[PDB]
């Protein structure tokens with residue numbers, strides 16, 4: 001089964017998921033001097049005031065927080081998007097060291113982690129249908145750098161003890177994802193894919209320019225999670241990131257000059 005090890009990591013995924021070598025794979029390096037400013041791009045509209053978080057879960061490749069997506073409560077619209085996209089979950093990718101961990105890079109610069117807020121296009125009725133469509137998902141990507149603590153992340157950090165190993169989950173209600181956003185919503189956007197299997201090419205990526213800062217004590221709490229299930233050999237959950245993929249016939253657009 002796929003993972004991030006020497007014998008089952010990203011260089012192996014194409015054997016089980018041939019689309020790994022496709023035409024619009026993610027993540028990519030964002031070359032800031034060749035991205036094109038597009039003044040026709042609208043500002044993002046993030047409406048998370050009514051968000052309802054449900055559960056936090058160790059799925060063996062990351063941890064994720066899931067939201068009620070049975071109504072239009074927490075939605076994303078605007079930017080490069082047509083229509084309304086509902087927030088489903090968020091999760092992180094992080095490194096073993098502070099110099100790596102993000103999936104996207106900016107001028108080859110790696111950040112310590114990357115936050116993905118996953119949304120699906122309500123036109124398609126359910127997330128399983130949306131993953132089959134070129135515009136089915138919109139993932140909002142936020143870089144993390146190590147510096148001052150982010151207070152809005154601490155309630156995530158404090159519960160990770162209870163989901164240390166694969167398959168553990170816990171109630172995680174009343175979490176407000178607005179505490180994870182930078183002050184600016186300036187962004188880059190390009191058409192791309194899921195960065196884990198099944199690697200479906202169904203994603204409009206929206207990558208924010210402005211990182212958020214997190215403290216060294218916060219990020220190293222991420223590094224104490226396990227890939228393994230309970231009662232197996234311990235293998236720390238670090239470096240759960242896919243390296244940058246060829247841009248091929250794609251243009252990265254910027255919302256800002």
Ligand SMILES: COc1cc(C[n+]2ccc3cc(OS(N)(=O)=O)ccc3c2)cc(OC)c1OC
Nearest residue numbers: 088116118127128131139193194195196197198
């Ligand atoms: C709600 O979770 C589901 C996710 C999915 C597929 N899915 C959605 C979002 C994903 C985001 C992913 O990560 S990322 N790094 O590209 O943002 C990786 C795999 C994903 C896979 C299918 C489902 O069946 C209908 C689901 O219902 C349980």
Ligand SMILES: [Zn+2]
Nearest residue numbers: 091093116195
């Ligand atoms: Zn992700």
